[PDB]
């Protein structure tokens, strides 16, 4: 029944908010729709895999909040294998390489690739992390898809194919589905292209020993009986002195304040009294999540390492079910595995198959790309299609179709009376990630502390000390990278 | 508690489904979220206006199902005033005209305008009404916005400006928001550009005497206590023998079958057990409704008619709050009024103002467009912002952003076990309209009758006899319209003789 704050949603963001409020001495209740916490993180345990992250998994330098929270909970990280060579597979052939970016030899193609990445970052510098709709060319960029941008920018099919894969991998959506403004903001707020795509020194550097699901589980342990599982919220009534929150099983909860820590569009599952203001009412019908199947194929050994391949594959083309893989082998060197993402329209297309059929397709792809018959002899398989999840809507995160961010973006984290908005979608740094989940949860919790007169306005947004365990190397460019001309620039010079 | 079919939603589609089922001898219940039926139709009555439609209103030739349903309920139509001249207001000046299309004098601009409309219809012919995703270039067209299509097609700012206004008016959304495939389908399934934009001989030809909301009200009267108001559905459980439907006030309903007659995205407000299949799960988060404020300004007399203006204004330009108006005077000639739409981004922008501030802006616009100081002397004002409606989501209808119709379109009316899908969005002829609501409601009811073994598969989709009261003139083109070149075609012809 009665408490200080009801938190709707027990993913990382809701759990982080609840923990903060609880630690401050308030009485909190977390209402969670599922029979588990973790949300878009989910760690499966069985004897075959020991543990595997079927949802959110990777953390890296500059993600200091998730690192701090996890460390406090007694968790440790290990490094994703990137010792040996990466592979770029293009037009049916594998090209091994080192460093974050797949190399390019054709000079014209080199100029075009260089200019594409550079231009993404140039554009991003004009986009405020906390208010992308304030970009000088906000409307122009918002009224275009990433597909139109790429069509204008890329003078080679090669650069355009890699740019397209980059978009599909980053936001699990097609270039024609997403706003140019939103995508450029998305990249910028993760620290730029190099940081977002990198394993070593970027977002995919590390995983948690034992799985990321332990973050939400261990907070649930701390909160004890304050977490209510299988309590989908159906109704929020703000017409009276105390906020009334009702669940599907008819339980009633009364609080001074509410934190909505669910994906924005999942706000649609709640009936509001009084109705939401017009802008939020429409916003929450305009913001879908992307489409992905996360697939993990297990092998007797990490055989790719013997051929001086780390297990990272960047795989061009329509025929490939999976466009990106990483080595998912345990730090001990056992439970050898390849993690792959089936992205965007392929998730939709390949979902029609059976589990066994998808396994076979992945193994045949990997055998080709790795040039290894050993890829054809899997010992186990796990996968999760996030498109089927009623209480997620997709993965990894919410994307903004053209026109939406400029028109509706400002209401995303705008409080509605006594409802404050957490969830990774509301973060300003690594929004879309576990890191942004923590930022948003703790910020929403502190907005409530301030509303209660407990802290100054000054302390709502709080900086994070850099992790000593995962230090960040700065992102550098070369003189030639900075100053080499684009394709049209070379033509203007001619 | 127990019945044959629960219908979720008491708008025209749900009411049409419920009526058909009831007439066939089944026990039906309608569960309606609001304290009223009608949904996206709403007829306000007070002494100042007598009655006024604040939501859906116009019907016209080829909309035979809504016409038949309304006639059977004892309703009559009247013709929207189009006796005098229409006005096209462009770059601060008004140009009166007759006929559906605003005329163009510059022969280059003339070629461009002609080619634009022609091309919309050309492309539409390639799109099946019942399966737009089967169009030969479906993916190509779906992966483009209407803005990109317009940028490629229109060689003049003049054609591009009018085309933009046409999209905004038709689907209450910006050109950059909507799929080109979806918009081309949407126009084609209303019978094409001429039919959709026309008053005389098109969609805006007529209104119902007394308001469109009488359609839903009169069906409610027929069904009696079977319509439950203020019963928003929160939960549908299909795990057992009978389907279980729960409302917000905790009432339980058990049925053999369910019809969902709500806007597709509003399916999100229901928790499903078992969960929806993956495609529908994601589809319902991908399909927003448009943005509109419908505004009616009342005057002492229909003074525009004295100046040989019928009251239709097509008003281009960012500064104009309202891009389209029609005369909304009663057929008796009293309660003189102008209806105008505030569309898409302007609905969002101008919603920040007060009602009094919006009235002032509209009057000042109308005075300018009509060249009439009388427009500054309104006697009354009514308006409705459909963006604020929890149980509509917007108006007039659902639009599809780029990429969505080809990926998700096929599940829109695909049954989910014992749930069948009605609502205007699922129609194949005049989807988006009251007409499409009737088609979809009755088709969904018959899908259930067929499932029950009561009718053959053959009878699920049923043709409609043409109205005798509202006959449809065919859509014609001229020889020149058909064969005049586009701008680039003229240029190709020039480059050819220069060799
Ligand atoms: C799915 C996924 C995500 C992911 C990714 C790969 C996949 C396949 N890889 C990631 C990675 O490597 N590194 C990273 O940092 N992030 C990665 N992502 C995304 C990441 O998992 C998410 O950003 C993060 O988990 C989001 O957290 P948040 O707390 O903001 O949101 P959530 O996990 O969805 O939690 C919401 C909870 O709310 C419950 N819910 C939903 N509706 C209700 C109602 N009505 N009532 C009560 N509770 C509700 C959900 O069940 C959920 O638990
Ligand atoms: C808003 C609008 C619409 C409109 C238009 C102008 C405006 C401003 N002009 C039109 C016109 O001139 N001619 C025409 O034919 N159509 C026009 N439109 C669109 C038209 O009104 C709609 O196409 C039509 O009314 C749609 O009917 P349909 O039956 O398909 O859908 P609905 O009216 O939205 O009814 C849905 C009902 O469901 C209830 N609801 C919603 N959620 C729930 C839940 N969870 N549980 C129970 N009931 C629910 C809604 O309250 C509604 O009554
Ligand atoms: N959520 C996992 C993930 C996200 C982004 C990239 N990337 O390369 O941009 C790789 C992997
Ligand atoms: N829903 C009203 C309406 C719809 C479409 C048009 N049009 O011109 O295409 C006019 C008015």
- Under DSSP, the state recorded for A179 is B
Contact B254, B2 (CB under 8 A): yes
Helices (H), A96-145: 107-124, 138-142
Strand, coil or helix: A11: strand
> In Å, how far is B115's CA from the nearest CA of chain A?
24
Query: How many C-beta atoms lie closer than 10 Å to residue A437's C-beta?
Result: 36
**Chain breaks after residues in chain B, where C lies over 2.5 Å from next N:** none
Strand, coil or helix: A302: coil
Q: Do A272 and B390 touch (CB under 8 A)?
A: yes
Closest-CA residue to B442 (of B77, B68, B129, B182): B68
**Is residue B474 domain-resident?**
no
Strand, coil or helix: A260: strand
Q: Which ligand is nearest to the CA of B56?
A: 2
Beta strands in B91-179 (DSSP E): 93-97
Mutate to test the interface with B, among A8, A152, A285 (most CBs of B within 10 A): A285
Q: What's the B27 CA to ligand 3 centre distance in angstroms?
A: 53
Q: Do B276 and A390 touch (CB under 8 A)?
A: yes
Mutate to test the interface with B, among A177, A403, A406 (most CBs of B within 10 A): A403
**Is residue B493 domain-resident?**
no
Count CA atoms within 13 Å of residue A215 on its CB side: 38
**Is residue A150 domain-resident?**
yes
Q: Do A388 and B275 touch (CB under 8 A)?
A: yes
Q: Which ligand is nearest to the CA of A395?
A: 1
The Cα B81–Cα B95 span in angstroms is 18
Tokens standing for A194? Answer: 């190099």
Contact B39, B216 (CB under 8 A): yes
Distances (CA, A) of B186 to A321, A415, B176, B295, B431: 33, 37, 16, 25, 7
Last residue of a domain, one of B175, B197, B219: B197
Contact A389, A59 (CB under 8 A): no
Whether B377 and B294 map to the same domain: the answer is: yes
Contact A430, A189 (CB under 8 A): yes
Q: Out of A271, A287, A390, whose CB is closest to B275?
A: A390
Q: What residue owns the CA closest to ligand 3's atom 4?
A: A170
**What is the total count of domains within chain A?**
3
Last residue of a domain, one of A354, A373, A400: A400
Contact B112, B154 (CB under 8 A): yes
Q: How far apart are the first and last CA of chain A?
A: 75
Whether A424 and A378 map to the same domain: the answer is: no
- Chain B residues whose CB is inside 8 A of the A271 CB are 232, 234, 248, 269, 390
H-run or E-run covering B384: strand B380-385
In the numeric block, the tokens 């399934």 are attached to B189
Q: How far apart are the first and last CA of chain B?
A: 82
Tokens standing for A164? Answer: 């397209």
Tokens standing for B314? Answer: 């097509």
Helices (H), A292-354: 345-350
- β A243-247/A233-237 pair status: antiparallel
The Cα B100–Cα A316 span in angstroms is 50
Dihedrals phi, psi of B282, to nearest 5 degrees: -85, -35
The Cα B456–Cα B240 span in angstroms is 27
Domain hosting residue A70, numbered range: 1-39+61-76+209-287+401-461
Radius of gyration over every alpha carbon of chain A, rounded to an integer in angstroms = 23
Whether A410 and A281 map to the same domain: the answer is: yes
Atom of ligand 1 nearest to the CA of A436: 23
Closest-CA residue to A214 (of A69, A89, A103): A69
Whether B213 and B348 map to the same domain: the answer is: no
Tokens standing for B459? Answer: 């009878």
Query: How many C-beta atoms lie closer than 10 Å to residue A324's C-beta?
Result: 20
> In Å, how far is B487's CA from the nearest CA of chain A?
23
DSSP letters, A60-106, are -TT-HHHHHHHHHTT--EEEPP-SSEEEEEETTEEEEE-SSSPP--S
Atom of ligand 4 nearest to the CA of B198: 8
Q: Out of A278, A288, A388, whose CB is closest to B286?
A: A288
Q: Which residue of A has its CA nearest to B140?
A: A176
Strand, coil or helix: B87: strand
Whether B55 and B65 map to the same domain: the answer is: no
Dihedrals phi, psi of A377, to nearest 5 degrees: -120, 65
Whether B130 and B155 map to the same domain: the answer is: yes
**Is residue A396 domain-resident?**
yes
> How big is the A-B interface in CB pairs under 8 Å?
124
The Cα A188–Cα A196 span in angstroms is 9
Dihedrals phi, psi of A208, to nearest 5 degrees: -85, 130
In the numeric block, the tokens 């390019």 are attached to A104
The Cα B171–Cα B292 span in angstroms is 10
Q: Do A285 and B289 touch (CB under 8 A)?
A: yes
Count CA atoms within 13 Å of residue A459 on its CB side: 10
Peptide bond into B499 cis (omega under 30): no
Q: Which ligand is nearest to the CA of B397?
A: 2
Closest-CA residue to A232 (of B342, B270, B227, B26): B270
Last residue of a domain, one of B400, B429, B445: B400
| Residues having CB within 6 Å of any atom of ligand 4 | B 58, 169-170, 196-197, 204, 396
Whether B30 and B142 map to the same domain: the answer is: no
Q: Which residue of B has its CA nearest to A246?
A: B248
Whether A387 and A295 map to the same domain: the answer is: yes
H-run or E-run covering B272: strand B271-273
Which CATH number do you get for residue A172? 1.10.405.10
Distances (CA, A) of A357 to A318, A351, A460, B164: 18, 10, 50, 47
Atom of ligand 2 nearest to the CA of B233: 46
Whether A190 and A162 map to the same domain: the answer is: yes
**Chain breaks after residues in chain A, where C lies over 2.5 Å from next N:** none
- Under DSSP, the state recorded for A225 is G
> In Å, how far is A271's CA from the nearest CA of chain B?
7
Contact B216, B38 (CB under 8 A): yes
Strand, coil or helix: A449: helix
Whether A281 and A420 map to the same domain: the answer is: yes
The Cα B484–Cα A244 span in angstroms is 66
**Is residue B420 domain-resident?**
yes
Tokens standing for A246? Answer: 């009702």
- Chain A residues whose CB is inside 8 A of the B393 CB are 281-282, 285
Tokens standing for A154? Answer: 């890329």
Atom of ligand 1 nearest to the CA of A270: 45
A69: buried, middle or exposed (CB in 10 Å: 19+, 13-18, 0-12)? buried
Q: Do A174 and B403 touch (CB under 8 A)?
A: yes
Atom of ligand 3 nearest to the CA of A58: 2
CA B357 to chain centroid: 27
Q: Out of B250, B345, B388, whose CB is closest to A278?
A: B388
A44 Rama sector, left if φ>0, alpha if ψ -120 to 50, beta otherwise = beta
């Amino acid at each position: 029944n009665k408490c200080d704050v009801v938190v709707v949603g027990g993913g990382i963001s809701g759990m982080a908010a609840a923990k903060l409020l609880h630690d401050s001495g308030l009485n909190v209740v977390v209402l969670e729709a599922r029979d588990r916490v973790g949300g878009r993180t989910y760690t499966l345990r069985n004897q075959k895999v020991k543990y595997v992250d079927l949802g959110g998994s990777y953390v890296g330098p500059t993600q200091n909040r998730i690192l701090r929270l996890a460390k406090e909970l007694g968790l440790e990280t290990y490094k994703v294998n990137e010792v040996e060579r990466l592979i770029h597979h293009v037009k049916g052939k594998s090209y091994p390489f080192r460093g974050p970016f797949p190399p390019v030899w054709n000079p014209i193609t080199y100029l075009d690739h260089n200019n594409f990445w550079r231009t993404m970052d140039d554009m991003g510098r004009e986009i405020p992390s906390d208010a992308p709709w304030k970009a000088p060319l906000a409307e122009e960029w918002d009224n275009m898809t990433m597909k139109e941008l790429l069509d204008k920018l890329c003078w080679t099919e090669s650069a355009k194919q890699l740019a397209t894969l980059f978009v599909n991998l980053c936001v699990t959506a097609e270039t024609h589905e997403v706003s140019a403004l939103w995508f450029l903001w998305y990249v910028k707020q993760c620290g730029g292209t190099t940081r977002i795509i990198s394993t070593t020194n970027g977002g995919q550097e590390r995983k948690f020993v034992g799985g990321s699901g332990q973050v939400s589980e261990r907070i649930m342990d701390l909160l004890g009986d304050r977490v209510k599982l299988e309590r989908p919220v159906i109704y929020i009534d703000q017409t009276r002195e105390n906020v009334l929150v009702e669940t599907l099983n008819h339980e009633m909860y009364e609080a001074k304040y509410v934190i909505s820590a669910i994906p924005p569009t999942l706000g649609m599952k709640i009936h509001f009294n009084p109705p939401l203001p017009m802008m939020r009412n429409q916003m929450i019908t305009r913001v879908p999540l992307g489409s992905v199947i996360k697939c993990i194929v297990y092998y007797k050994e990490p055989f790719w390492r013997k051929k001086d391949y780390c297990g990272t594959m960047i795989i061009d083309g329509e025929e490939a079910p999976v466009a990106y893989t990483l080595d998912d082998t345990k730090p001990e060197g056992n439970y050898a595995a390849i993690m792959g993402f089936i992205l965007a329209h392929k998730a939709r297309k390949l979902a029609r198959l059976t589990k066994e059929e998808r396994l076979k397709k992945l193994c045949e792809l990997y055998a080709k790309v790795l040039g290894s018959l050993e890829a054809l002899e899997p010992v186990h398989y796990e996968e999760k299609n996030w498109c089927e999840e009623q209480y997620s809507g997709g993965c990894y995160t919410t994307y903004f179709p053209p026109g939406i961010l400029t028109q509706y973006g400002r209401v995303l984290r705008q409080p509605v009376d006594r409802i404050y908005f957490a969830g990774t979608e509301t973060a300003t740094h690594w929004s879309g990630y576990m890191e942004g989940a923590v930022e948003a949860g703790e910020r929403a919790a502190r907005e409530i502390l301030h509303a209660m007169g407990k802290i100054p306005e000054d302390e709502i947004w709080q900086s994070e000390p850099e992790s000593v365990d995962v230090p960040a190397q700065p992102i550098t460019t070369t003189f030639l990278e900075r100053h080499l001309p684009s394709v049209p620039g070379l033509l203007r010079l001619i």
